[PDB]
Design a protein around this nucleic acid. Structure first.
Lengths: 334, 350
DNA sequence: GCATCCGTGAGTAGAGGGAAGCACAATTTAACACTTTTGTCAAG
DNA sequence: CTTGACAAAAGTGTTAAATTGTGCTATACTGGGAGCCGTCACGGATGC
């Protein structure tokens, strides 16, 4: 018992009897009148219409709480003519709660047709419940249409949007998700007519104007889902995908040792230069603080122009070239 | 992890703990003077959803009348358990019986048993046995063409109700503006409607009948009961480890071996918390830590496809359900929808 | 006692394996026209 | 060491094109589906 969350939810919603046609009309009328009374109260009292509905909703639900009591007492201090709109607002809020509770069976019937598309059954039901709440606010009973006629549009829309937003590890925009679904549906129809898997050219032509084979292949590459690192490989359960993927981010011991050898040999060659010549190259190349320094900031640090540093920076470079050619001690590092 | 650490401190069995944690039964934190089945409700008492609803919202029932037949009772007339409200249905509780939807309104004009057929898209705006001034509306309608008004003064009588609602409540007619509104909770002696002239004599929830010019107080209690880890967390916060240790030490003096063995196991957990300095309420989570991303990588491979760990999917489920509960709470969703979301959030953490 | 629940069971290697559309509003991206930089060729 | 004086490069501002996010649709429709025993055998702890 209680091991099935789906069974537990179905039992709870079955304890609310279904509404008759007479009962549905009364609830819809009460909600609409209550919303109008809230608008009337705000105009007279000057407060935010959004804030007033929260105070009424808080009292009905029961159980900033400090200001909720303060605002409520001001409403109750109105005269009898204005206190009547308070009564209508309270009744309208209670009717909205009862109207939503009696239509929970409708969402379950709709939500069972969307399973197997990336979301669990309970997740589909909860997303559908959000659409049901929206339909209550926008429903109009003057048109003499039944509630299920208008609420079905909102319940289906909420489930569809949730799938396009939460069913993929790498989220794709809704406009591109629709394109992917159309592309797959078109390919299936061509496959059963051609008797074989269609090519990219055939899919592109049937897709419509503005589509070529290059765009078809690019869309298919986008629609690829990542693979799990814990996917078992082989019958014995000891090997997984992650056991074959090397790490390319951290430097290897061989690469780390080459950097150290190059640095110690480079600084050894710099000692053959003058004290001022070495400092210019070490700053104009960025061997201190990691940042290259232009002829201006170098000039600012040493108090000289930029044309002067240009010559001495080049002069020190040419002396290094002559030394290297006579020993061949710095060539293997390139 | 058998034996449960939370259950040992709170003296709750494994069956009881699962029922509260996964939203199956309520647990009492404040009885507020509630009586169930003639026995006062105690703290730490487990209530079913049916029992909780009776204590919190009262008892009432509706009986659908067959088409054409007419009830033998009047509006606002008290009935007893087993009394035949209609020839086709019998009542199951005592209370005030009120008409729900009169399918035919028989207005008695004074100049006259005129018969009016009321469509489901129409509502009656006057009460039974009431004086209606000439020109006032009697039955409202969506279309003004089919709207019915009062030709002259008379007494309006309701006939052929769609159903009869029997609610165990007390009716207090009011003369002036009511000092309370629908949804409030009152206690005996409180000023109810007419600034102290009319006062309630029983606990209950008050709803205002504007058309009937009466105030109804449905007998109920403002009991404090909660489900989930929220109710367990408060119980752990109120625990006094020093006081509990002394009580268990005295029970250790029982000559029976079974009681001594039971008291020793509980005292071992109590002593462990006292020595270490941890708090019992820390066993319930408020903030969930997140592993560093490099330990749950999403990396590209020699080709172009991506590979990722299963922990990323488990983190995505928890975030999606946590964000949906925030939106549901802001919209004032009913408790049934909220309770399902909370149960799903607990399972996502597991 | 006797019912219910829960964690445990050798090592290394290989080798295959691996299901709507639309309109409209915000929001980001790319192209392009000036404009200050900053290295430079030539003197002095 | 310095001044001049370009010439390409880097930097900035505006703006149209592309992409992304959000709301809505009115006959009536109101409690899921899948599974199926060589169900692994044996101690240890716990509840009653």
């Amino acid at each position: 018992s209680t091991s099935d969350p789906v069974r537990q939810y179905l039992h709870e919603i079955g304890q609310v009897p279904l509404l008759t046609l007479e009962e549905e009309v009364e609830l819809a009328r009460k909600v609409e009148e209550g919303m109008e009374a809230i608008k009337k109260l705000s105009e007279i009292t000057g407060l935010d219409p959004d804030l007033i509905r929260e105070v009424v909703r808080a009292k009905i639900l029961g159980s900033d709480p400090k200001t909720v009591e303060e605002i409520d007492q001001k409403l109750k201090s109105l005269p009898k003519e204005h206190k009547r709109y308070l009564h209508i607002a309270r009744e309208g809020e209670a009717a909205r709660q009862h109207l939503i509770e009696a239509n929970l069976r409708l969402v379950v019937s709709i939500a069972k047709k969307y399973t197997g598309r990336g979301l669990s059954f309970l997740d589909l039901i909860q997303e559908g419940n959000q659409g049901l709440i929206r339909a209550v606010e926008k429903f109009e009973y003057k048109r003499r249409f039944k509630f299920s006629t208008y609420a079905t549009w909102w319940i289906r829309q909420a489930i569809n949007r949730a799938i396009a937003d939460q069913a993929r590890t790498i989220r794709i925009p809704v406009h591109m998700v629709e394109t992917i679904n159309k592309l797959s549906r078109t390919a299936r129809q061509l496959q059963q007519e051609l008797g074989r898997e269609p090519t990219y050219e055939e899919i592109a032509e049937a897709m419509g104007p503005g589509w070529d084979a290059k765009r078809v292949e690019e869309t298919l590459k986008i629609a690829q889902e990542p693979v799990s690192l814990e996917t078992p490989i082989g019958d014995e359960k000891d090997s997984f995908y992650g056991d074959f993927i090397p790490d390319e981010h951290l430097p290897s011991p061989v690469d780390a040792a080459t950097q150290s050898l190059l640095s110690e040999e480079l600084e050894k060659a710099l000692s053959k230069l003058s004290e001022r010549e070495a400092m210019v190259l070490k700053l104009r190349k960025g061997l201190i603080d990691g940042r290259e320094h232009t002829l201006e900031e170098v000039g600012a640090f040493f108090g000289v122009t930029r044309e002067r540093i240009r010559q001495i920076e080049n002069k020190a470079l040419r002396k290094l070239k002559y030394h290297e050619s006579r020993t061949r001690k710095l060539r293997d590092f390139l | 992890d058998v034996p449960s650490k939370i259950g040992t401190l709170l003296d709750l069995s494994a069956t009881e703990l699962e029922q509260v944690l996964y939203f199956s039964k309520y647990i009492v934190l404040d009885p507020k003077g509630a009586i169930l089945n003639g026995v006062p409700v105690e703290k730490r008492q487990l209530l079913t959803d049916e029992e909780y609803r009776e204590l919190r919202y009262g008892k009432q029932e509706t009986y659908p009348l067959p088409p054409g037949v007419d009830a033998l009772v009047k509006d606002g007339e008290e009935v007893v358990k087993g009394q035949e409200l209609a020839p086709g249905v019998v009542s199951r509780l005592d209370g005030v019986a009120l008409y729900r939807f009169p399918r035919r309104v028989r207005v008695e004009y004074v100049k006259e048993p005129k018969d009016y057929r009321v469509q489901p898209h129409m509502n009656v705006v006057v009460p039974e046995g009431a004086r209606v001034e000439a020109g006032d509306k009697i039955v409202a309608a969506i279309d003004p063409e089919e709207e019915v008004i009062a030709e002259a003064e008379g007494v309006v009588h309701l006939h052929e109700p769609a159903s009869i609602l029997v609610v165990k409540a007390r009716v207090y007619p009011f003369e002036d503006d009511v000092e309370v509104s629908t949804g409030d909770r009152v206690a005996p002696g409180d000023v109810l409607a007419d600034g102290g002239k009319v006062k309630s004599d029983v606990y209950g929830r008050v709803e205002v009948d504007l058309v009937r010019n009466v105030v109804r107080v449905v007998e109920s209690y403002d009991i404090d009961a909660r489900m989930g880890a929220e109710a367990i967390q408060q119980l752990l916060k109120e625990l006094d480890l020093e006081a509990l240790e002394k009580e268990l030490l005295e029970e250790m003096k029982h000559p029976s071996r079974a009681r001594r063995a039971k008291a020793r196991k509980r005292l071992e957990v109590v002593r462990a918390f006292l020595d270490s300095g941890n708090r019992p309420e820390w066993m319930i989570l408020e903030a969930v830590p997140v592993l560093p991303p490099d330990l749950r990588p999403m990396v590209q491979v020699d080709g172009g496809r991506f590979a990722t760990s299963d922990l990323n999917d488990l983190y995505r489920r928890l975030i999606n359900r946590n964000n949906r509960l925030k939106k549901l709470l802001a919209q004032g969703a009913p408790e049934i929808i909220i309770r399902n979301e909370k149960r799903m959030l607990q399972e996502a953490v597991d």
